[PDB]
């Protein structure tokens, strides 16, 4: 069991809704997505604090369909630290933006060289200012957009993920999956297109996808029916010939909504996979598909109330989950601002209160320490062990 310590709240009504939380691979910097395009970034104090902020997207009004596309950054993903400047992938409903957050490198240089407005010539315009403007040395972190991805997703975007080899990253919308090269942002390879020719028969919605963390070729994409398909780009260029399908008395009207898997994450070791359906967190060993190795219940009392949650909007809520860096434990959110940690070692589950009514939709786990970050709607919590 892990004795989690209550988080300090550092961040904090409609634009400020944390739609994603994500630690960098070496977890020093924490970037949180938003429903207002402001990716609030924090970083761990060198032995977390507000680091920077950048407007990843504006309300891009589509003029071909008149759809008032929101600035909803549904995913934040870090890249490896190519240089001193860190990079972040931010994806709104329609388009991805690659960002560079660099410190002020020229702080000393700007102080070491300065002349008059006319390059030390007489009759300078701002004669005093030049005497003082020479002191530009500052410690602030400077955000900057590097590469703009194209408008490829004809539908709301739900997932992106950096591949194990840092040339490409995954992008999946509710109907298709496109593979984006990191620097080559003018084109994308549509690796999966489940779209039925006639939208009448729309049964399958790709609700989430990710890349296998250690294998550059293995990736999984969920489905509305819960059938998690583990694809392998080694088999073929197009991944419609999926390698495996993961699938499991109570067959109510809403069997078609409880079976929808809102989130899928691989273990840090890539030995196990954890899929969050509405009611249960299913943990699958990747070599056995007809059942999970362990099934976990996220909330017992909500199984019968599928009309009441359907009169309300609550039953559509997208929940997510995350693993320990050691994979020994997993954690996911529940309603009423409660999240649950499902320890696979002792099979003991401990629920935790963040401080129905409030939903912990998104959360994250630091890949090197028992640090977890929680995306409450109007708050951000980083719980320690």
């Amino acid at each position: 069991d892990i004795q989690w310590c209550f988080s300090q709240v550092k961040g904090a009504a409609e634009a400020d809704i944390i739609s994603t939380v994500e630690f960098n691979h070496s977890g020093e910097l924490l970037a949180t997505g938003d429903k207002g395009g402001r990716v609030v970034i924090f970083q761990q104090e060198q032995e977390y604090n507000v680091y920077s902020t950048f407007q990843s997207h504006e309300p891009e009004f589509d003029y071909l369909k008149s759809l008032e596309i929101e600035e909803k950054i549904n995913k934040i993903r870090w890249l490896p630290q190519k240089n001193a400047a860190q990079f972040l992938l931010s994806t709104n409903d329609k388009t991805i933006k690659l960002w560079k957050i660099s410190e002020r490198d020229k702080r000393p240089e700007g102080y070491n060289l300065k002349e008059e407005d006319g390059r030390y010539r007489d009759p300078t315009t701002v004669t005093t200012l030049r005497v003082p403007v020479f002191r530009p040395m500052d410690l602030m972190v400077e955000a900057s957009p590097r590469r703009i991805f194209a408008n490829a997703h004809t539908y709301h975007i739900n997932s992106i993920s950096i591949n194990s080899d840092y040339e490409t990253y995954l992008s999946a919308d509710d109907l298709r999956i496109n593979l984006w090269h990191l620097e080559i942002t003018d084109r994308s390879f549509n690796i999966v297109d489940i779209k039925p020719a006639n939208m009448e028969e729309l049964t399958e919605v790709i609700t989430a996808a990710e890349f296998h963390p250690n294998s550059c070729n293995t990736f999984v994409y969920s489905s509305s029916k819960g059938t998690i398909r583990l694809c392998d780009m080694r088999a073929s260029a197009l991944c419609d010939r999926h390698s495996k399908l993961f699938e499991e008395s109570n067959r109510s009207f809403f069997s078609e909504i409880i079976s929808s898997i809102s989130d899928v994450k691989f273990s840090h070791s890539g030995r196990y996979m954890m899929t969050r359906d509405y009611l249960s967190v299913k943990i699958w060993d990747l070599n056995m598909e007809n059942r999970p190795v362990e099934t976990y219940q996220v909330h017992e009392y909500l199984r019968s109330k599928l009309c009441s949650l359907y009169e309300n909007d609550c039953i559509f809520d997208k929940f997510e989950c995350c693993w320990n860096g050691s994979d020994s434990v997993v954690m996911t959110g529940s309603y009423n601002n409660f999240f649950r940690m499902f320890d696979r070692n002792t099979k003991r589950d401990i629920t935790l209160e963040a401080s129905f009514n409030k939903k912990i939709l998104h959360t994250a786990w630091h890949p090197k320490e028992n640090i977890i970050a929680v995306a409450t709607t109007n708050n951000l919590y980083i719980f320690q062990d």
Binding site: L202, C307, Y310
Partner: protein
């Protein structure tokens, strides 16, 4: 049986049409989930 579920077919349609007015139009996930819950015409 007494009416506890007829609500659902009408709400199935009621949420389909209530989506088109909101920001971003249809969310195909929530729209398909709302559309798959229904009620048999006769028994």
């Amino acid at each position: 049986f007494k009416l506890e579920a007829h609500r659902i077919v009408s709400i199935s349609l009621g949420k389909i049409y209530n989506s088109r007015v909101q920001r971003g139009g249809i969310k195909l996930h929530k729209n398909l989930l709302v559309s798959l819950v229904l009620r048999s015409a006769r028994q």
